[PDB]
Amino acid sequence: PNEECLQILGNAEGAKFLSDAEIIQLVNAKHIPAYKLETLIETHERGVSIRRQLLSKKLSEPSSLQYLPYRDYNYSLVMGACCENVIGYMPIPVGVAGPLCLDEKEFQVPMATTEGCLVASTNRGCRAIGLGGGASSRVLADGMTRGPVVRLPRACDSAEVKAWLETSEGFAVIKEAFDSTSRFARLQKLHTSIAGRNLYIRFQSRSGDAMGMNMISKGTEKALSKLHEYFPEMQILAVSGNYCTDKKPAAINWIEGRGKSVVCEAVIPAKVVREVLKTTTEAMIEVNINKNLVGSAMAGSIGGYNAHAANIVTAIYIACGQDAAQNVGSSNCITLMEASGPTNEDLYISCTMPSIEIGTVGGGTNLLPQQACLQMLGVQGACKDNPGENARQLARIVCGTVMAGELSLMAALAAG
Amino acid sequence: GAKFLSDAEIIQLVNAKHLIETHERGVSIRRQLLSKKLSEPSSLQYLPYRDYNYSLVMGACCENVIGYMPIPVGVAGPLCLDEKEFQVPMATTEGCLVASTNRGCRAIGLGGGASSRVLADGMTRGPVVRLPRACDSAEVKAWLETSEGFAVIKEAFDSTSRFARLQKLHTSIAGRNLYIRFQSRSGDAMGMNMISKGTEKALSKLHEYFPEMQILAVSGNYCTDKKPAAINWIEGRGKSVVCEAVIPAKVVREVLKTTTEAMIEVNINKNLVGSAMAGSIGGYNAHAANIVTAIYIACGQDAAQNVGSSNCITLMEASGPTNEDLYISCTMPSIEIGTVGGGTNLLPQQACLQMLGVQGACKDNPGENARQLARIVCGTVMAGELSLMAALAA
Amino acid sequence: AKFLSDAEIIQLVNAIETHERGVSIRRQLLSKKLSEPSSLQYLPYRDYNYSLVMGACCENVIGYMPIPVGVAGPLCLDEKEFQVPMATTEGCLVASTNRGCRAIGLGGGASSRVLADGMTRGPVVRLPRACDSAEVKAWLETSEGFAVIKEAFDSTSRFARLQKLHTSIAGRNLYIRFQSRSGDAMGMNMISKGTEKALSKLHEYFPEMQILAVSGNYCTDKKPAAINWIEGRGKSVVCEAVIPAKVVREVLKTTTEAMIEVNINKNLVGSAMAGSIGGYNAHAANIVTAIYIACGQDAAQNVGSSNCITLMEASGPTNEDLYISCTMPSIEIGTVGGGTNLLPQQACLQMLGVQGACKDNPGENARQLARIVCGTVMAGELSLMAALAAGH
Amino acid sequence: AKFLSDAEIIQLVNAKHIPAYKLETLIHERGVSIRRQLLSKKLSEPSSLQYLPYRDYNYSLVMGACCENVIGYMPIPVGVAGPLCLDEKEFQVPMATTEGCLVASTNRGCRAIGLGGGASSRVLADGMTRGPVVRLPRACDSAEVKAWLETSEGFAVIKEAFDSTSRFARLQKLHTSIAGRNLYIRFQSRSGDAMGMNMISKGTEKALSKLHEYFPEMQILAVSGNYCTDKKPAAINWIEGRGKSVVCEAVIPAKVVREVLKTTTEAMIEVNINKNLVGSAMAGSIGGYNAHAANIVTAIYIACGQDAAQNVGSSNCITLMEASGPTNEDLYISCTMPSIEIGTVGGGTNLLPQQACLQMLGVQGACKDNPGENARQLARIVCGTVMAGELSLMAALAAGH
Ligand SMILES: CC(C)n1c(CC[C@@H](O)C[C@@H](O)CC(=O)O)c(-c2ccc(F)cc2)c(-c2ccc(F)cc2)c1C(=O)Nc1ccccc1
Ligand SMILES: CC(C)n1c(CC[C@@H](O)C[C@@H](O)CC(=O)O)c(-c2ccc(F)cc2)c(-c2ccc(F)cc2)c1C(=O)Nc1ccccc1
Ligand SMILES: CC(C)n1c(CC[C@@H](O)C[C@@H](O)CC(=O)O)c(-c2ccc(F)cc2)c(-c2ccc(F)cc2)c1C(=O)Nc1ccccc1
Ligand SMILES: CC(C)n1c(CC[C@@H](O)C[C@@H](O)CC(=O)O)c(-c2ccc(F)cc2)c(-c2ccc(F)cc2)c1C(=O)Nc1ccccc1
């Protein structure tokens, strides 16, 4: 009825003795507040069921959520960690491009997308590479960043703090405070910029196999606590002052790197360019120069000297539990093509991606389906013997798959 | 046919270099084939695949399919936008993102609501052609800028589809390269394939006037699609949108745990000065990409287009009788979006579109559903900016 | 003053007849305040025509700075020959540019085209709300709205002919980019006059509009900006030439294949790694700056006027000939007004056959000068790139 | 050749008895006169050089050093803006320009700064750069070279080869970027008081010679691969700095903003945010978050014998304005300029008229007891004068009319 239901709710034995309708009655009349539903209802799926039911009555079409699935999904690894106000899950089709012949190994790359032909095209690119003797890649740099903004009374004071951070002694003190927060914390050279009394400080460090935002933030907050002891008039405006730079386009990531900086390359014989890619080396180069270099230049691109790196980065990231919003900066790529061999008929190809933001532990990689795709690549979880090696390998795979994707689309655009 | 054989027998046929009548059994066999090639043969255990509607995916949205990836969906709302309320779905695995955005919606609702406008509408495709000499490409640019030249090109472009309605051309020369940016609305479709078809016919017509022209590529990165580029920021691409709200001083204190004065200081020195020092083009915001990407995954959009669709400048100012109220606006000139085609043909993705009342084509007013979804995106972005900026202020 | 002494006038102030004595007195007054009173010893000031400078080109004038002018030519451009003046203090610059001119000449000369023409100004206005700024953008975009604004703008001057508007919104800010030719003048003052009269007219339709500044940096004038690269500003120009393989080896001391390699990997890839917007060239700014100083241009406008993409590819039957092109979207320039009122810089404009207004075809002298700047830049690219390729 | 006449030498070249442009070796003031006379008859108007000055100017320091094929010189009017009250000092700033009202406006900016207790500046960083592109057979090999250059022992070997070419050559930390088999190497060092291009180029070439021993396969494609970056707009100069990075600031009392600048603190903050931050942002600027730094930079440079072409990057500036004081009524202003490329020795600073302008500011030539102090000081004057210019123009725009 209503009164009886509240007696049963407050009875230490609880909400599981009420029906869905009785609980909703109690919400509509203002006896139980919308937010408290999380702790009161026992099972996670039943919490989702009720939130959906409440939501449906507020929609102009109450049957809207019919085909949004929710049942029998492991919400235990999601509640309090990955999502709030959960009403179900969104299934994204997963496909496989491979084998990807990279650094003398073969990889079957999972790709989550709803764009027709993207996987097939990426697959034909892998085929060209494989018959061409495989690709090779190198991690050139490694370190996630966080770029807080502090304010001092005057610009002369901000300059003083900058000079202090650049002394051997001052940096060593900040480094100890940063490095004390974690096993993996290992602060690299600080990069700083002034704008008046503003001072942007870019902390960079490895972070084992995790993407590292949480870890770099704990090291950063304690590093600024130490800096405040030497400069007590300094104010910390924001733990992020956009100098990182995270999830926005920025030259600083392209130039300094962020996360993993990777280069990949292959040489495709003329015969493979002809039979797999249906074009010539000469035609490919002409398209690459005038589209990926000259065209991006006329559009005023910073870091966007590629055909569709973002397609590959986004499909792999969604499949592999990465933060897909980091496609903004992680897609940064320059794709170069030149003639190779004795008569300039073989295609040399390289992709350079200075800011791959990636990890195999933490965040979405804690969910089991996301982990199935990480296991396909042999990169799931933390590498105990060699910390960071799995995330490094996953970066290489992304760069190699991007190259495969650049090969195929460019050959398609070359013919017509 | 294949139904009279077992799994092991069909697999024997594939291994000897030599069809299946259900989509799901096709998926199963591909998974078994793939699993023998992996170092951990059990790695696919927790990748689900059963009972998914593969009939709308095969031959349309994905190839070599081995299952699906579940992304948790949460709701941020109610979002009070243009005298209406929306419950915004957000597919994400980042803890706190949905809660933070939800808090931004709460501040906006208590402050009277947000208001938005679509400022421009047209998807683009930017091919690169070339002529024997730069003088020749200059002749072609000139011809295209005459009203008679543009009219014959518009006639060719427009004949390919109902919604193909060529707007003003934008051209750029680099030596004998000519980059031509074609632009048009596309109903409620995002419109890539449609504009591509109009482009092919228009260039074919241009060749009749200029036979020495070579079409080097149907995209010469002048569009620009899925790469950062100032041209999308300055000219727009897809929907250009602005949203705004005024948040009373009291609400900023109670819901957001800061003050108007503090919000302004952080916005200016983070989203304007900070982004400036970082050398940003179009990234003058805190985390528009989090909300764009989450809404996109949930609503069947092309998540790769978060690259350009995330472009956003966030501005905060003093407001009201005593300058204690918080004016906020987000401006997003290049939201690339649609409610038909691509991932929006799938049923779960269509559930999230039905939530917002923007699913499929609007018959009475073509494009209105895609326009409305772009406004919701800009409003949900503004909500997400409100809260995170407030969190960073404290 | 005529009956007084240099010293008595100086004591009057502490406690004029001609311009040169006004300069002499200012120099002496200033020399008192310097730690080294004889600093101005070798700063020349005598026998300079100060009448055209006062109240027009410079204030508090203590003299003038001599910048060596050298000549690079002949430059065979559009079947004409040009002796290009270059005011510089950088050694080897004129000499290198000259070698590039010689290379082009032996390849049959350069061809250029003006692709677009219109100086801009980009005010920022504010409305009470973003919805009001959007209403104004929409109004400006209708044919009737644009026509009202065009009539206003065009009424201020005989050369004021308003082209298509370009606008951008940022909340309640609206940025409006006005564009028009301006005869042979660079045209900032003219464009500004037309802009303010047009904004006044816009205010009659939208009284709540606040005009924040007549430049809101949307122009964009004398700062690096992608809008100039993509939409253009002033004159947009392309120049090209084909250098025979024999000329590349003999005059330039390199090969076609080596030139293409250096250009791709320095001017495209290198500039791309450096995060350049509009700087896809070797040293356009050197040539631009030198011509500008010599021809009475606003040298500060070298910021955007130097915007350039230099391309090189194989040409001819053998694929051994060198094709070169420079594309310069935003050359800001004029042959009337400002520093081109002065007689010495007019001498340099007279060398080029472009001094003053073109009466038969207004704007044609400024266009011609922009073609010369782009051609001379291409010559400078040719030579510096050759020298980088051959490597000492 | 002095025993012949003008008309005779010209008759010899026209008749082709003597090679034309190989005559000024046999013949400086008269060498110019003959080049002009020969040149005038090739022109559509043979009297066009009439009013181009050439007599009574020292061409000896100019010939084979600053200019070639010289036909005269171009006078640029020089105004003075001052006193500029900067770091407890007072400067009279030479500004060579032909733009009306520029000197006057900058002057009003100086006047407001002086009446607000003056400005303060700091050099934040210092070092000229050169950014060659080298090529290895493969990206993997280019990666090898980048890892080697990053080891402390690889760096010291390169640092010793770099520092050997000059006493001022002190190589700072190397910055590298890979693009396939391309490696771009940004060499940076102080250069005393010189702007330092030729000096850094010397040390770079020797340094690459050393690197060529450890990796014989390396091709030096070009001594500049645009990674410096010199005389083109580039985010790398904005983010890393180049030449001198400098910051300047002052507080203008409210009353001074009203009486001298004819506006208010509130109006100035508003215009600055929406023009120099938001406006530049909408226009797609990297490094151009200012009103007209280029005007001031260009004018000082021309007057002081700097390379005016380097105004492209030297003008990079962000101008910030903010409420100051107890009632938020005073104006805080600051200009940050990360890439002022400048020098007081070498190039155009060797010419005497240019040296007079340098002497005016007390920075001509080398500072013997503190090397580089004169160029640093000039950099600070540039940034201070830029801030004066921003003050005045922004107030003019804020008021209107
Ligand atoms: C499937 C993808 C990878 N793809 C695209 C879309 C890429 C899109 O998401 C980003 C681009 O917009 C980025 C850019 O280039 O600016 C096109 C495509 C591209 C551009 C265009 F204008 C029209 C179509 C093509 C394609 C290009 C030429 C053909 F003649 C045909 C198709 C393919 C593609 O790779 N198809 C493909 C199928 C089976 C096997 C091999 C190959
Ligand atoms: C959940 C998200 C939206 N969030 C983040 C991550 C945003 C991330 O995806 C983009 C950023 O990297 C973009 C940028 O700013 O550069 C932070 C966060 C940000 C930066 C940082 F260094 C440390 C943490 C915060 C946060 C900020 C201040 C606090 F004091 C605490 C948390 C929140 C956040 O919104 N938390 C939140 C929870 C419940 C309710 C309300 C509010
Ligand atoms: C005279 C000028 C045009 N020049 C320069 C300086 C250009 C300078 O102001 C802009 C550059 O910095 C822009 C850039 O490329 O980044 C160099 C020069 C360039 C770079 C460098 F590291 C060392 C020297 C060269 C040069 C280059 C290679 C040689 F092996 C020798 C000289 C010349 C030049 O063109 N000299 C020259 C003389 C007679 C005839 C032909 C040719
Ligand atoms: C003398 C210069 C420094 N100045 C300019 C031109 C600057 C020009 O080279 C760069 C700009 O284009 C950069 C930019 O803002 O984008 C304007 C000017 C600017 C823009 C415009 F649209 C109309 C005029 C002004 C000015 C501005 C408002 C007034 F109401 C009047 C004039 C002055 C100026 O400083 N005048 C001035 C005179 C005596 C004393 C004090 C002050």
Sequence-distant (≥ 6) Cβ neighbours of residue C171 within 8 angstroms: B242, B244, B313, B315, B317, B327, B329, B331, C130, C133
What method was applied to determine this entry? X-ray
To test the ligand 3 pocket, which listed residue (C384, C385, C388, C392) has its Cβ within 8 A of the most ligand atoms?
Answer: C384
Cβ of A64 under 8 Å from any chain B Cβ? yes
Ligand 2, atom 2: nearest CA belongs to which residue? B97
CB of A416 closer than 6 A to ligand 1?
Answer: yes
DSSP A83: B
* Interchain contact, D238 vs B279, CB within 8 Å: yes
Alpha helices per DSSP H over A257-355: 270-275, 281-287, 294-298, 309-319, 327-330
Which of A114, A115, A121 has most ligand 1 atoms within 8 Å of its beta carbon, as the pocket-test mutant? A121
User: Which amino acid is residue D157, in one-letter code?
Assistant: V
- B297 and B189 assigned to the same domain: no
Are B199 and B166 in contact by the 8 Å Cβ rule? The answer is no
Q: Determine the Cα–Cα distance for residues B261 and B245; give it in Å rounded to an integer.
A: 16
**Spatial separation of the C-alpha atoms in residues B61 and B67, rounded to whole Å:** 13
Cα–Cα distance measured from residue B378 to residue B367, given in angstroms and rounded to the nearest whole number: 17
Residues A129 and A151 in one domain: no
How close does chain D come to C318, measured CA to CA in Å? Answer: 24
Pocket test for ligand 3, best of D162, D229, D230, D307 (most atoms within 8 A of CB): D230
Contact A249 B73 (CB under 8 A): no
Q: Write out residues 16-55 of B within 8 Å (CB-CB) of A.
A: 30, 34, 37-40, 43-48, 52
Ligand 2 centroid – CA B391 distance (Å): 7
Q: How far is B371 from chain D (nearest CA, A)?
A: 23
Q: Cβ contacts of residue D375 below 8 Å, gap of 6+?
A: D192, D193, D194, D195, D244, D342, D343, D344, D345, D363
8-state DSSP, D366: -
Asked about B94 being catalytic, the answer comes back as: yes
**How many CB atoms sit inside 10 A of residue D368's CB?**
9
Distance to chain C for D389, nearest Cα, Å: 14
Q: How many CB atoms lie within 10 A of CB D370?
A: 11
Report which secondary-structure segment, H or E, holds A200.
Answer: strand A198-205
Tell me which residue of A127, C95, A324, C390 sits closest to D222, measured CA to CA.
Answer: C390
H helices of chain B, in order, are 7-15, 23-35, 97-110, 134-145, 147-158, 192-209, 230-235, 249-254, 260-267, 273-277, 288-298, 306-309, 347-355, 368-393
Q: Is B42 exposed, middle or buried (0-12, 13-18, 19+ CB in 10 A)?
A: exposed
* C233 Cβ closer than 6 Å to some ligand 4 atom: no
Q: By the 8 A CB rule, do B315 and B264 touch?
A: no
> What is the Cα–Cα distance from A176 to C380, expressed in whole angstroms?
53
Query: B38 CA to middle of ligand 1, Å?
Result: 30
Q: Is the CB of D223 under 6 A from ligand 3?
A: yes
Whether residues D332 and D298 fall in one domain: yes
Judged by a CB distance cut-off of 8 A, whether residue A269 touches chain B is: no
B104 is in an annotated binding site: yes
For ligand 1, whether the C-beta of A307 sits within 6 Å is: yes
Question: Hey, of D289, D336, D340, which one would you mutate to test binding to chain A, going by the most A CBs within 10 A of its CB?
Answer: D336
Positive/negative CA dihedral, A402, A405, A407, A411: negative
Report the CATH number that the domain containing residue B308 is assigned in CATH. Answer: 3.90.770.10
Same domain, A64 and A148: no
**CB-CB contact of A265 with D139 (8 Å):** yes
Binding positions of A for CoA: 121-127, 276-278
B302 in active site: yes
Angle, in degrees to the nearest 10, between helices D293-303 and D102-115: 100
DSSP tally for chain C: helices H, then strands E: 14, 11
Q: Which two tokens stand for residue C25?
A: 């007195």
CA dihedral sign, ordered B358, B363, B364, B370: positive
- CA–CA gap between residue B121 and residue B333 (Å, rounded): 10
This structure's resolution (Å) is 2.0
Rg of chain D over Cα atoms, rounded to whole angstroms, equals 25
* DSSP-derived 3-state class of residue B216: strand
Burial of A35 (0-12, 13-18, 19+ CB in 10 A): exposed
Structural domain total, chain D: 3
Q: Is B272 on the interface with C (CB under 8 A)?
A: no
Same domain? D90 vs D51 = no
Whether residue B356 is found in the same domain as residue B271: yes
Tell me which chain C residues have a C-beta less than 8 angstroms from the C-beta of B315: 170-171, 173
Backbone angles phi, psi at B129, to 5 degrees: -115, 165
Active site residues of C: 90, 222, 298
**Which residues are within 8 A (CB) of A383 and not within 5 positions of it... i.e. 6 or more apart?**
A209, A389, A390
B42/chain A closest Cα distance in angstroms: 9
Residue D172 beta carbon below 6 angstroms from any ligand 3 atom:
no
Q: How many CB atoms lie within 10 A of CB D6?
A: 11
A271 and A126, same domain (yes or no): yes
From the CA of D309, the nearest ligand is 3
Task: For residue A323, indicate whether it is catalytic.
Answer: yes
The token pair at C10 is 């100086």
- Nearest ligand for residue A123 CA: 1
Atom of ligand 3 nearest to the CA of D223: 22
Which other chains touch chain C, taking contact as 3+ CB pairs less than 8 Å apart?
A, B, D
CB contact under 8 A, D52 and C344: yes
Q: Which of B299, B244, B224 is nearest to A297 (CA)?
A: B224
Residue B233, domain extent = 122-238
Name the one residue in this structure whose structure tokens are 């960073």: B392
Output the CA torsion sign for A146, A150, A156, A160: negative
d(CA C330, CA A86): 53
CB contacts of A305 in chain C (<8 Å) are: 272
Beta-carbon contacts of D259 under 8 Å, excluding residues fewer than 6 positions away, are: none
Beta carbons of B255 and B335 less than 8 angstroms apart:
no
Phi and psi at residue D286, to the nearest 5°: -115, 110
Distance from CA of C230 to the nearest CA of B (A): 7
Contact assessment for residue B68 and residue B351, using Cβ atoms and an 8 Å cutoff? no
Q: Is B142 exposed, middle or buried (0-12, 13-18, 19+ CB in 10 A)?
A: middle
Q: How far is CA D309 from CA C157, C263, C330, in A?
A: 34, 21, 16
Task: Please indicate, yes or no, whether residues C186 and C272 belong to a single structural domain of this protein.
Answer: no
Kindly state whether residues C158 and C175 are assigned to the same domain: yes
d(CA D164, CA D68): 32
A136 plus A58 within the same structural domain: no
- Of A228, A259, A290, at which residue does a domain stop? A259
Q: Does B272 touch chain D (CB under 8 A)?
A: yes
Classify burial at A2, counting beta carbons within 10 Å of its beta carbon; exposed 0-12, middle 13-18, buried 19 or more. Answer: exposed
Choose one of C205, C234, C263: the last residue of a domain.
Answer: C234
Q: Of A104, A132, A110, which Cα lies nearest the Cα of A349? A: A132
Distance CA(A135)–CA(A101), nearest Å, equals: 6
CATH of residue A69's domain is 1.10.3270.10
Report yes or no: A252 at the D interface, CB cutoff 8 Å.
yes
How far is it, in rounded angstroms, from Cα A240 to Cα A262?
Answer: 25
Whether residue C98 is annotated as binding a ligand: the answer is: yes
Which of A259, A276, A295 is a domain's end point?
Answer: A259
- C-alpha distances (whole Å) from D387 to each of C63, C222, D121, D250, D311 are 25, 16, 11, 9, 16
The answer to whether the CB of D130 is under 6 A from ligand 3 is: yes
B326-345 residues touching A, CB cutoff 8 A = 342-343
DSSP state of C265: I
Q: Is C244 helix (H, G, I), strand (E, B) or coil?
A: coil
The tally of CA atoms less than 13 A away on the side-chain side of residue D58 is 11
In this structure, the answer to whether residues B214 and B253 fall within a common structural domain is no
Nearest CA to ligand 1 atom 42: A121
Burial of D143 (0-12, 13-18, 19+ CB in 10 A): buried
| Atom nearest to B221 CA in ligand 1 | 16
Exposure of B267 in the CB half-sphere (CA atoms within 13 A): 26
Of B177, B226, B281, Cβ closest to residue A294: B177
Asked whether D51 and D43 are in contact (CB, 8 A), the reply is no
Contact B389, A239 (CB under 8 A): no
Find the closest chain B residue to C78 by CA distance: B135
By annotation, the residues of D acting in catalysis are: 99, 231, 307
Interface test with B, best of D272, D274, D286, D290 (most B CBs within 10 A): D286
Let me know whether C276 and C389 are in one domain: yes
- Rounded distance, CA A322 to CA A358, Å? 7
The CATH number that applies at residue B177 is: 3.30.70.420
Is A2 inside a domain boundary? no
Query: Exposed, middle or buried: residue B288 (CB in 10 Å: 0-12, 13-18, 19+)?
Result: buried
